[PDB]
Structures are given as structure tokens and as C-alpha cells.
Amino acid sequence: MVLNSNELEHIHSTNHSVNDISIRWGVIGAGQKGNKEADLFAGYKFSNGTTCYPTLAVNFAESDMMHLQNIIKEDRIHFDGLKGAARTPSVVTDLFDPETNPNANGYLDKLAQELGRKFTNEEGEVIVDQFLICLGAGGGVGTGWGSLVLQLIREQFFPCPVSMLISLPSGDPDEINNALVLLSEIDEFMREQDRLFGNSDIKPLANVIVNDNTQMQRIIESQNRYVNWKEVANDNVVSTLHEINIIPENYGSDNVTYDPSDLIKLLSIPGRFLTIGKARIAKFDLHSLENSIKRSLDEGFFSAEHQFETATMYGGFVLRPSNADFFKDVNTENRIRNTLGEYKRLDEIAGKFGDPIWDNEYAVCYTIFAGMTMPKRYISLAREGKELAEKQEQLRAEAQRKQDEEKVDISFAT
Amino acid sequence: TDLFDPETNPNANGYLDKLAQELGRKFTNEEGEVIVDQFLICLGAGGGVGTGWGSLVLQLIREQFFPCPVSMLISLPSGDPDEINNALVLLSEIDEFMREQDRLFGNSDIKPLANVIVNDNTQMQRIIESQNRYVNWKEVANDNVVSTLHEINIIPENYGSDNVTYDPSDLIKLLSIPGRFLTIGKARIAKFDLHSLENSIKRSLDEGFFSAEHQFETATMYGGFVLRPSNADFFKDVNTENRIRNTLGEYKRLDEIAGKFGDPIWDNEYAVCYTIFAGMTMPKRYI
């Protein structure tokens, strides 16, 4: 029963019949970042007390997983005689490839197997609509797993589509190159997927959701006195995803319902880069409403300089109080359509935007843009790692010559 | 070096048989599994036997005499001009070998000379006389450097963390790949507040048992971890994480080189903070 946002608090005290969700995610967290996000998902329960999401944790370092809290030991999957890949992701792709490793195919049996156990019925009903794979780009185990997953969904290894929740690394030239090769592999796969599947078809890679660790830290230090920024960042991105999954299945509207089918379409069909903006609304007036939607989109936890003009679909909803007449007001509807319009004119792509009724005293506004192309953070990362990588080709040489240029005289010794 | 060289000594090669042999007995399986990941060779630079052995080892790892990489734990001499020249010729032979190793092996490759760890006998005495009433300074210095190395070997295999695990693979990478000069700072932490935490990390690095005026700016890799109590909320605190990243940052900005820094959970009532910098160039104590 994790409750890691005060939206989740206020809709579990209020609502004691939260018994379903819009999409039955099967969560797999690879590498430690992934493990920790996965551990949060595993914690969530319904009002009745059942678990929401079947969850596995995967790693090479058996020691990243020993301080998990909601993931039972049985569900902590790890690989033998391997102490860890060492911030090098080609170690994971290798352990699973016949060409390099001989028992490669053996490992896949234990993956196919523990997949079978956690996401399958007594029959073989996959008990899951799509897989959510959590990664921290930059590390060995995580980034490697990312690549292996791309490779696996080509052999149609998974029963259903795969959503990847990927985090971009803060600032370390080895991590940046790792992150860049994955993001590049993803951009390629997405382009191949665009030529192989129709605009209407269900995609095998449902979407990829990025967070940027730089942007997330910036935010956290703007907003009992110890704060693990990672712990906070995780709470925000995970609780947001959980919220947008709860709400359509559990709250409704006299005006425009955003139901679960709309969300499933959003997460299933576009098949590219997806972003979310969660905006709290306290001041019921247009100037503030605007500057918080704009803020959640541009300076929020899921912002990575996204290419909104390339979005092919939208979704969203404002959870609002039963009374607050400020939302029935048309003048308020236009301000949203035109505010979001500045990113993508909403007529020009397919979607829906709802306004469900909730118990509480404030309005939370969730905005989702899907089908976008590669985020521009990719370029600025490429550029940031160049000014470090090249800055220490200089420093390695700056002092390797200092080696060559100065012998010290010890002729008096030998 | 003479007793082991055909050019000077004739039964030179005979001696190597008894070395190859007693190596075989102590570090090999009933099969020939070397039962050992790397060799730790302890020396006191300055003497005959020790310093000589140091040179012979450099020579031996070139003929690929050893099954696996070699770490050398070398101590620098206190103050005797014959000992200093001896120490200097070895340290010079090491700087040369390390430079040859840099051109022959990749930045990713396992190095045959895994690393060299120096202690300076002057710096170690200074410390011991700042900190039953007899004290053999050598006996104490040894206890500190050896127990530190043992600690950093125990901890990753035996203690873990909900936040960031520093596991054994991370340590093996640290000790295996950089292949140059390596240092350690062991800092006890009693006062849970930022000003003190800092001034003990800084102290362990600059005025500790492994300090020899190291060239931190030349470090190519880092590692470390703070063993902390299960409860002490002062370590979950972010404000405490930043103070470490920026404190260590003053030696080498930690983004600029490859590593990891963990915070394992332990039983006890205080926090011990181990910091390791590897891949460094020749220490300034040499000058």
C-alpha cells in the first residue's frame, strides 16, 4: 500500500472502491534504478488489498536487490556467477547471444520461464495488457537490458506490447555514450516500426517515456530534513503513471468522460516518444491555470525538450471538484485548448480531453502527448558529453607530455 | 635482481624453478585453478631484499610469469640517503612500466600490473604520534594499512544498501583496470553534521595513512562507500549526499571519471567513509 503523492492519499481516503485500473501493466525493472521504480509499482494495492501490478526485478548485481521492500525474493531475478557488468552494457547483450555466449539460449529459458510464472494464468492468459520496463540509461545492467529488450521484441519474445520507462543520465561521459547508443537504437527501431505497421495497428513497442535526471534534480531543489533526490524523483514519475492509470477507470464526468479505452489507444497506437505534464491547480483563475499547464509540460518531471510539433496523438484530463463552477465555465475550456494548442494545435492530431469529477478541493491537470519524435535532450546530451570527453583528451595529454618532458636525475643511484 | 639473472648468475634459472614451484603449491588447485584473482606483493622500499624483489616482480610480469594481475603495496622510506636512492630507482622503474602498459593495453583491458598502492613512512609516523604504554609505530602503521585493505575487501561482499549498492564487481573493476597509482582514505564519522563529515573525508585523503601528495587531478576512476547505521536519518538526507559529491569533487570532479559511491547499511553506531581514487600518475612525494 504505497501512497507516494498526496493525490494518491486523497483518492484512497475518499474512494474505497478503487478496484480496477485502465491498463494492466506488467512491470519489469532492470538495473538498480529500474529495480527501485519497480519496487514502488509492486507496492500499490487496490482498495480490497490485492496487488495492482505483477512485478519482477532483474539485475546482475545480486546486491542491488537486497534492500527491495515490496518485491518478494522469489521475484528478484538474477544471473549466476555474474557479480555485475561494470558500467558496460555490451556485457548484457553478450550473455544472451549464441554467437558470443554458448549457454546464451539457456539463460533465455530462465527468462522465458520467470516471465511464464509472473505474467501467466493457470491457462496461459497473459494476465497483462502491456509490459512496463523500467531502466536507468547509463549503467551497464540497465542500458544493456534496454538493448536486449529491443532485440527480444523482434523475435516476438513477449506476448504483448512493451512500454519502456527510461531515465537519462546526469553527467558522466561513459554513462552519456551508453545512454546515447540506446536512445539511438530506439530511434532506429521506431523508424523500422513506422514502415512495418499501419497508423491504426497495435505496435509491439507501445511507447517510450523519458525522464531527464538533470531536469529532475533542478526541480527537486526548488521544491524532518533529508531528501534523497532519486527517491523523490521516483515517487513523482511512478505516482504520476499510477494516477493516470487509476483515474479513467474510477472517476467520471457529466461533460466529457475520459474512459480507459481512450488511454489504451494513447499508450498503444502511436508507438514513439511519449510525455506527461501533471499540473496542480490551486488558484482558480486563467492566468495561473495556464502558467501551471505550461510549467508541467516544459519544466516538469517528464520534460526533456520534447518535439511537440511531431506529436500524433493527445490525451488528458482535469480532475476537478464537484462544485467549482470555474471549470464548467467555457472561457476556461478555451484556455486549455489554446494553451495546449501552442505545443500542438489539438485539432491537427487525434485525441480527447476530459474533466472528471472528484471529491477534493483542488484541480489536478494531466496532459499527455504521444507519438513524438526523438527529444532534443538527445542533442544537448550529445553536446554535453563532447565538452567533457574532448576536455579530457586534453587533460590526459596535458599531463602525459608532462611525463615525457621531465625525467628526474637519479644517475646518482644506479 | 642478480641472483635471478642468467647473465650474472648461472643457477639463476634454478632459483626461478623454486619460485615457480612454491607459487604452484600455494596459489594452485588440485587442477591448476589458480585459487586467486590477483597477487598482492608487500614491500618496504629502501632495503635490499624488498626493493630488489620489487624490481624482480616488474621483470617477471613481463615474462608473463604470473597467472593473473599483480597489485603492489609499497612503503616509502623515512630518511636515509641510501634507502632514498633505492626507493627512487624502484618508483622510477614503476613509472616507466606503467607508461609502457598504457601504450600496450586499452582503457578497458585488464592490466598485468593492476595497481600500486603507496604509503609514506614520514606521513605515517606524523599521524601515529598525534593519536599499557608502548607503541611500535611500525606495528601500528601496519595494522592501519592492512586492516583498511581487508575492510574494503570484506564490505562489498557482505553489506548492502536500499539506495546504492557498491558490490564486489565495482571494486574489482577499480583495482583491475586503471593500472596505475591508487590511494585510499578511511574516515571515521562520529559527529553527524556536514562541517565535520567534510573535514574528516578531507583529512583521510590529505593527512591519512595512504597520503603521499597524490595527483588526484590525474585519477581515471573512483570508488567508495559510507558504511552507516540502519537508522541514522542523517545519511538519507540529500544535503548530505551533495556534500560528499562536491567534497570529493575538489580532488577530481566525480562526473569526469568513471566510478560509483555506495552507502551500505551496518549494525553499528557510527559511519565509516572509505574513499578510493585509482589510475593516478606518480605521487609528488617522489619529487
Q: Which helix (H) or strand (E) holds B50?
A: helix B48-62
How far apart, in whole angstroms, are the C-alpha atoms of residue B84 and residue B51?
11
User: Do residues A64 and A142 lie in contact, with contact meaning Cβ atoms separated by under 8 Å?
Assistant: no
Which chain B residues are closer than 8 Å to A170 by Cβ?
255
Distance set, CA A103 to CA A83, A207, A298, B75, B101 (Å): 17, 32, 47, 46, 34
Report residue A410 CA to chain centroid gap.
60
Does B49 carry a binding-site annotation?
A: yes
Single out the residue of B257, B249, B260 nearest to residue B171, CA to CA. B260
Interchain pair A88, B108: CB under 8 A: yes
Question: In this complex, is the C-beta atom of A212 within 8 Å of any C-beta atom belonging to chain B?
Answer: no
Distance CA A337, CA A339 (A): 6
**A226 → closest Cβ in B156, B169, B239:** B239
Q: Is residue A242 exposed (0-12), middle (13-18) or buried (19+ Cβ within 10 Å)?
A: buried
Q: Which helix (H) or strand (E) holds A136?
A: strand A130-136
Angle at A18 between CA A248 and CA A33, to 5 degrees: 80
Q: Which residues of A touch B235 (CB under 8 A)?
A: 226
- Chain A residues with CB inside 8 Å of B86's CB? 413
Give dist(CA A65, CA A47) in Å, integer.
Answer: 28
| A17, A41 Cβ separation under 8 angstroms | no
Across A261-296, b (16+ Cβ under 10 Å) vs e yields ebbbbbbbbbbbbbbbbbbebeebebeebbebbbeb
C-alpha distances in Å from residue A385, one per residue of A173, A204, A212, A349, B180? 5, 32, 15, 35, 25
Distance CA A247, CA A260 (A): 9
> Would you state the cell numbers that stand for residue B196, as one nine-digit string?
565535520
End-to-end CA distance of chain B: 25
- Angle at which helix A173-196 crosses helix A377-398, to 10 degrees, equals 150
Tell me the H-state helices in B105-235: 121-128, 137-158, 168-176, 194-206
Half-sphere exposure of residue A27, counting CA atoms within 13 Å on the CB side? 29
d(CA B190, CA B210): 21
Measure in Å the smallest separation between the Cα of A170 and chain B Cα atoms: 9
Contact B89 A410 (CB under 8 A): yes
According to DSSP, the β-strands at A162-168 and A130-136 are parallel
Number of CB atoms found within 10 A of residue A158's CB: 19
Distances (CA, A) of B193 to B196, B243, B248, B265: 6, 10, 17, 19
Return the C-alpha torsion angle A407, A409, A413, B1, nearest 10: 10
Centroid of chain to Cα B21: 28
Cα B65 from Cα B69, distance rounded (Å): 10
**Cβ separation A225–B217 shorter than 8 A:** no
Centroid of chain to Cα A277: 13
Return all residues near B210 (Cβ < 8 A) that are at least 6 apart. B117, B118, B119, B145, B148, B183, B184, B185
* Among B110, B80, B114, CA closest to B97: B114
Grid cell of B50 as nine digits:
624488498
Query: Residues preceding discontinuities in chain A at C–N > 2.5 Å?
Result: 223
**A225 contacts in chain B (CB < 8 Å):** 237, 239
- Cβ–Cβ gap A63/B165 under 8 Å: yes
Q: How far is CA A367 from CA A74, A240, A293, in A?
A: 37, 11, 8
Residues of A in contact with B240 (CB under 8 A): 226
How close B168 gets to chain A, by Cα (Å)? 7
Q: At what angle do helices A31-43 and A229-250 cross, to 10 degrees?
A: 40
Q: Closest by alpha carbon to A313, among A158, A203, A187?
A: A203
Q: Cite the DSSP H helix spans in A69-103.
A: 90-95
Count the neighbouring beta carbons within 10 Å of the beta carbon of residue A76. Answer: 18
Which of B128, B151, B124 shows the shortest CA–CA distance to B226?
A: B151
State the Cα torsion B94-B96-B98-B101 to the nearest 10°. Answer: -140
Cβ–Cβ < 8 Å for A61, A114: no
- Assess A389–B contact: CB distance below 8 Å, yes or no: no
Dihedral angle over CA of A121, A125, A129, A134, nearest 10? 40
Nearest to A158 by CA among A130, A186, A190: A130
**Which triple of cell numbers denotes residue B57?**
616482480
Q: Going by C-beta distance under 8 Å and a sequence separation of 6 or more, which residues neighbour residue B228?
A: B235, B263, B264, B265, B266, B271
Instruction: Tally the C-alpha atoms within 13 A of residue B283's C-alpha that lie toward its C-beta.
Output: 22
H/E element, A190: helix A173-196
Q: For residue A405, with 0-12 CB atoms within 10 Å meaning exposed, 13-18 middle and 19 or more buried, which class applies?
A: exposed
For residue A33, list chain B residues with Cβ-Cβ distance below 8 A. Answer: none
Residue where the block lists cell 523500467: A134
The SS3 call for residue B182 is strand
C-alpha cell at A196: 512495418
Contact A208, A186 (CB under 8 A): yes
A136 assigned to a ligand binding site: no
Is B130 within 8 Å of B118 (Cβ atoms)? no
Q: Is B237 on the interface with A (CB under 8 A)?
A: yes
Phi-psi region of A124 (alpha: psi -120 to 50; beta: other; left: phi over 0): left
> How many beta-carbon contacts under 8 Å exist across A and B?
99
CB atoms within 10 A of CB A106: 11
Place of cell 648468475: B9
